[PDB]
Structure 1
Amino acid sequence: GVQVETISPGDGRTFPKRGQTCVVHYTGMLEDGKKFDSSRDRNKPFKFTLGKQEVIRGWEEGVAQMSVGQRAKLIISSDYAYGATGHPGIIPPHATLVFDVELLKLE
């Protein structure tokens, strides 16, 4: 894998720790630019706990790299993404994913 490219800076000091709940707002696109998911469409931030394996590996590492209040772009290869199986009906097999993730807060 996952590459992180900052879009807007965070505080630069606080980073998620294992067992902490990260609240994020994200938009997901395929490598060719086709949007397939977005929490902003549902108007509800997405919460997940680090280290519980609730999210794909690319997310688990990229959000950990990010810092609170930061906006970033995560480029996740297939292996860190759903991989060969994919997500039938949503993500094709062997698909690189691009995410625009904002880390709103830690709880």
Structure 2
Amino acid sequence: GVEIETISPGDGRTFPKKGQTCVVHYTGMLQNGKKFDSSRDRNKPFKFRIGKQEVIKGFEEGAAQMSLGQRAKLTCTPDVAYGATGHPGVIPPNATLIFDVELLNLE
């Protein structure tokens, strides 16, 4: 599952509720240190409410397993990620994903 790992946690208890834009500023990663995604290079913090199934539930479950201002190393898996299908052209089949997640605000 989402084997969350903290980096620089803040209050540690401001967990996200339903209909709360997790203002995530992550830097998506793969195994081997091969980058596949980034929000810091964009300067566009990722935003998603809970439950609506925009992102893979790695982000949803990790965010739910996460507080405000919590820099964390998320670890998604192929079951929750694109899996044996893979986002084509970028992601191959059967991939384990990593995210330098850092939730900031909830609106």
TM-score, with structure 2 as normaliser: 0.96
The equivalent residue for 1:60 is: 60
Structure 2 Cα separation of the partners of residues 71 and 44 of structure 1: 17
Mapped to 2, the partners of 1:74 and 1:99 lie a distance apart of: 5
Where do 5+ consecutive residues of structure 1 fail to align? none
The structure in which a higher percent of residues are strand is 1
Structure 2: stretches of 5+ with no match in the other structure: none
Query: Counterpart in 2 of 1:26?
Result: 26
Moved over 2 A (4+): none
Match of 1:13 in 2: 13
Instruction: For 2:24, give the aligned amino acid.
Output: V
* Per-residue deviation, 1:94: 0.5
Amino acid at match of 1:39: S
* 1:29 shift after superposition: 1.1
Aligned counterpart, 1:87: 87
Displacement of 1:13 in angstroms is 2.3
Alignment of 1:70-85 (within 5 A): 70-85=70-85
**Cα distance in 2 for residues equivalent to 1:106 and 1:51:** 15
Give TM-score, length-normalised by structure 1: 0.96
Quote the Cα distance in structure 2 between the aligned partners of 1:91 and 1:27.
16
* Inter-partner Cα distance in structure 2 for 1:30 and 1:9: 22
Distance 2:105 2:28 in 1: 20
Match of 2:36 in 1: 36
Cα RMSD after superposing both structures: 0.8
How many residues align? The count is 107
Letter in 2 for 1:105: N
